[PDB]
Design a protein around this ligand. Structure first.
Ligand SMILES: [Ca+2]
Ligand SMILES: [Ca+2]
Ligand SMILES: [Ca+2]
Ligand SMILES: [Ca+2]
Ligand SMILES: [Ca+2]
Ligand SMILES: [Ca+2]
Ligand SMILES: [Ca+2]
Ligand SMILES: [Cl-]
Ligand SMILES: [Cl-]
Ligand SMILES: [Cl-]
Ligand SMILES: [Cl-]
Ligand SMILES: [Cl-]
Ligand SMILES: [Cl-]
Ligand SMILES: [Cl-]
Ligand SMILES: [Cl-]
Lengths: 57, 281, 264, 281, 264, 57
């Protein structure tokens, strides 16, 4: 049942988690999720725009 | 995963022009420093760990302050001070609300924590034995108390927590309880369609989330009967969203709130302080 | 030969052309689609009217003047009286729709000005009385194809009964946030020197698979003059802005008698 | 690993002369006893465990004493006694500071512990219910409280600890938070370059670390409203550096401090007690 | 997408864009470069300041009028007071440099005019007294970033002491040759109907590998109105010409105390 | 997740550690580090000095 995961590094290891409760709502924080896709907000265009090319041709 | 490193680049003399674009397209500017200056190589070991949604929301925030008392009540008004009820919401305070309102929709479990404090009302009426509090979650439809010692507090089905004064702040988790597939922080609509020639009032009806939201009621009492010394208590309620997802970002609140809606106040709609000149460093 | 400036859009029996576009936006990078069985909710076989309703409807035009502060519409409200889309909307309890929004504004190489065109999910706006909160009438919230206008002044009513409309204050986007940040919403700009149209393709956006169209607008459409219209030979000139919108992937559930909303 | 053992050695009569050197080179003397006397073999099992940096710094040290009160305040001065703010530093006290200042630069995580004590102000005003304290860390830029019950204490994003009087001393860890790659204990410089013919004041400006350091503010309140009995509290703040690295050793402080800088006081610059004669055993 | 009219040039911390260029000239077909060991002369390890000095410096702008006869600068003189390039130049006995020269002049589709932009090796000009020959003061030969102007008249001085400046007579290119033949030098034309900029990339040119920059200008830059500026609504209108120049592959030898030339 | 390490000896074994927290800053003291190089302070000279030899030759 024990999960061993990497800690966030400090000034200068791993840590252990066991879930004690039958509901996932009881669990501690979700693990770090570094997912991102800024383009859905910063570049939501139909036709691909190549930076080095003219935006309008 | 780390934020972007910078590559070694020199100059250019080229028909490739990454410095120019056309934001009419709806795309933001995309150019980075290596597109417009000579750059050295810099390895970036830094991460965006603390700006993930879980990190941004990973705090218990105070959302309200409730009051309850324990004393010999001989009037209706004083009897109503022996318990309190509160419609569960995040709009009594501004800080967590503003953070949530960076988004249109969210989905999360909730950690609720409480801080309970007391003081003596006066010093010429003896003392008071240590008090136990009951905090009862009343889902929509369940009977609400009309007295601090009525039958509703037996709480056969509603969740209650009994807290003993001086003990660690009590705490429980709540699942994502929305009846939709996410919570809505904004709802551009009404609870019913008013129809042609109906006699239902249309002059005093409301608009938006207030017409459709109902997260039930928190009821709080001191379980003890009265002492000669009147004790007054505050219950601070804290919320931490966890296991968080959010959708559809929004500009953040720029001016003071004046209630549960998006309404603004005429004396408080000038957030910017004017600069002396457009050329002010 | 092919160009970011030249586009044709055909839906049903209707086609739009533009020769001075600036690409097109697909909101949040997602094209509209029908509702999958694994995300479905109401269980009756839905009506999918297809070409009868999924086609371009052109609203009444508005006039851009040097003094204009902007315009707003809500969706599906703006199309509620549009052909078979409106009929399908009102004969059913539930509906969902995506949209192609095409905003049109041409001028000349000697005019100048810039319009921000924003699609805003759940575009909740402030009311115009400080005696109440969230106090807006159904009729004022749902103007239909005429939409509404922004103002540069906020003058809340003396009596609550007279303030049951939106306080559409331009620089606060009618909702207490700074208009300069509206670019976090799917958008294009019509900058007269560059382009004469904006095109936004919108998926259905909601916290539910399907909802009551007559109760709830999923999107706001906002057009704000970011840079005022100017024309040297006549500063009082006016140029039209025309809004043309096609529902897409429309799906309706809960058929009964027709909904006829209150009009006053 | 152990300190050095001593080898068995006899005498010498040799052109090898380890007893002589030239410290002009910048090298310290290097000779050991086996170089200059006859030695027996002694196995050294002793270690330098307790003088590693982690061992030297492995203690919680008091760095300040704060005061807060809880009573019915009717004046501005008394309202300001209901909470306190403190710019986080190690220079209010001398002991930990002096140890850190054996080094120019350091890098460490921090364990912070607090000891909270109370007394009654008087005995003719009844009693007081058990108090809960809030200790809020306010990073630079976050709004600072102007009253004990203003909006800042809702602490949606700032870390706060709520401590119940009589419970175990509260404690939390802080990462290495420096904006440089190490903390500087000494900074021979200024926060900005004053430029030729500028109108900015140059007569009241400061020098060194005080011009650039900012570790935020600790704000403390009693969460309870007032009792008839006024309660006065002290909060002692303790720091322990852990996971420690240090660089560039320095002579230790030889004379009393007189503030946050390296300045010394004219009546306290004679640390040595004179000996009677150079020949005094 | 890519075009002879649209260009970006980045050197050091500086970037130029143009959207109405006309290709670019590389003088004599040769890009600048550092000095090879097999062509070297001074033997001390050279200073190569790279990005500190090899970057675009923008000179004070001049005004093109219908009556303008033209402008000249010398190089490295025009850049002698420019940031770290100037410092490296004056702290050393010897220096060499190539250049990117970018001349900028925009107008409108209703203006007309044409500028010849010429890079001239060893641009020796005539003096303004007929009592002497080759009689020009150091100060007048080296005006710095202000450069000089051409005239359409030659009026040599009555006294030799008053004529120690260039006789910059336009049609003789200030040096006794016909200006119509200046096209034998590396050049572009800024013809307002076609382009708004000229770009010339210059290698080091000299009869030596490296030389005394404070004594000797390697290049002249000449801008001549070949066709006068005309604008129908206002024939007296003026449009700016802006000159921006980046040293390239700079190399310096013979470090000592700083050279401070005479100023009068 | 458990680390077993040697204890510091007393008057007359091993011990076990498990990290409970996701941040390394939360961890107990760093393990004894006996690293040292006094010569960087006691003999920071460019040219090697042999003790038995003359310091200056
Ligand atoms: Ca581009
Ligand atoms: Ca990286
Ligand atoms: Ca580059
Ligand atoms: Ca069908
Ligand atoms: Ca040993
Ligand atoms: Ca010996
Ligand atoms: Ca020796
Ligand atoms: Cl009960
Ligand atoms: Cl009781
Ligand atoms: Cl309509
Ligand atoms: Cl009606
Ligand atoms: Cl609070
Ligand atoms: Cl209290
Ligand atoms: Cl100059
Ligand atoms: Cl002089």
């Amino acid at each position: 049942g024990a999960q061993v995961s990497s800690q966030k590094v400090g000034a200068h290891v791993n840590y252990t988690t066991i879930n004690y409760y039958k509901d996932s709502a009881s669990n501690a924080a979700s693990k770090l999720d570094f997912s991102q896709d800024p383009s859905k907000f910063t570049e939501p265009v139909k036709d691909i725009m190549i930076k080095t090319a003219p935006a309008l041709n | 995963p780390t934020a972007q490193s910078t590559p070694l680049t020199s100059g250019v003399n080229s028909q490739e022009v990454p410095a120019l674009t056309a934001v009419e397209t709806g795309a933001s500017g995309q150019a980075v420093p290596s597109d417009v200056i000579e750059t050295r190589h810099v390895v970036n070991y830094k991460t965006r760990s603390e700006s993930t949604l879980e990190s941004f929301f990973g705090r218990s925030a105070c959302v309200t302050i409730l009051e309850v008392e324990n004393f010999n009540a001989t009037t209706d008004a004083d009897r109503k001070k022996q318990f309190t009820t509160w419609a569960i919401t995040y709009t009594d305070t501004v800080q967590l609300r503003r953070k949530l309102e960076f988004f249109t929709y969210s989905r999360f479990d909730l950690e609720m924590t409480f801080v309970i404090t007391e003081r003596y009302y006066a010093s010429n009426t003896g003392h008071a034995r240590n008090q136990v509090y009951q905090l009862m979650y009343i889902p929509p439809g369940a009977p609400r108390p009309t007295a601090w010692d009525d039958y509703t507090w037996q709480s056969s089905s509603n969740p209650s927590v009994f807290y003993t004064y001086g003990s660690a702040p009590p705490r429980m988790s709540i699942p994502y309880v929305g009846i939709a597939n996410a919570y809505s922080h904004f709802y551009d609509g009404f609870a019913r369609v008013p129809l042609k020639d109906e006699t239902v009032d249309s002059g005093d009806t409301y608009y938006g989330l207030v017409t459709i939201n109902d997260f039930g009621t928190l009821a709080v009492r001191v379980v003890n009967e009265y002492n000669p010394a009147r004790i007054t208590s505050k219950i601070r309620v804290y919320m931490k969203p966890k296991h968080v997802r959010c959708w559809c970002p929004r500009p953040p609140r720029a001016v003071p709130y004046r209630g549960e809606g998006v309404d603004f106040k005429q004396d408080s709609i000038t957030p910017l302080t004017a600069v002396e000149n457009i050329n002010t460093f | 030969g092919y160009s970011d400036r030249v586009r044709q859009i055909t839906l049903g029996n209707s086609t739009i052309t533009t020769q001075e576009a600036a690409n097109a936006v697909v909101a949040y990078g997602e094209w509209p689609s029908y509702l999958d069985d694994k995300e479905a909710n109401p269980i009756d076989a839905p009506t999918e009217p297809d070409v009868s309703s999924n086609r371009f409807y052109t609203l009444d035009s508005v006039q851009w003047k040097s003094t204009s502060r902007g315009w707003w519409w809500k969706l599906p409200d703006a199309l509620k009286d549009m052909g078979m889309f409106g009929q399908n909307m009102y004969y059913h309890y539930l509906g969902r729709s995506g949209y192609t929004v095409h905003v049109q504004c041409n001028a000349s190489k000697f005019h100048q000005g810039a319009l921000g065109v924003f699609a805003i999910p759940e575009y909740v706006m402030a009311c115009n009385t400080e005696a109440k909160t969230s106090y807006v009438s159904y009729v004022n919230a749902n103007p239909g194809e005429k939409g509404g206008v922004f103002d540069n002044a906020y003058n809340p009513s003396a009596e609550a009964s007279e303030g049951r409309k939106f306080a559409a204050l331009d620089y606060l986007l009618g909702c207490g946030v700074l208009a300069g940040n509206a670019f976090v919403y799917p958008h294009q700009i019509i900058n007269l020197r560059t382009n004469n149209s904006a095109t936004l393709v919108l998926p259905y956006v909601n916290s539910l698979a399907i909802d009551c169209m007559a109760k709830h607008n999923n999107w706001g459409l906002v057009i704000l003059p970011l840079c005022k219209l100017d024309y040297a030979p006549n500063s009082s000139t006016e140029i039209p802005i025309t809004v043309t919108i096609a529902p897409m992937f429309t799906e309706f559930n809960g058929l009964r008698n027709i909904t006829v909303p209150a009009t006053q």
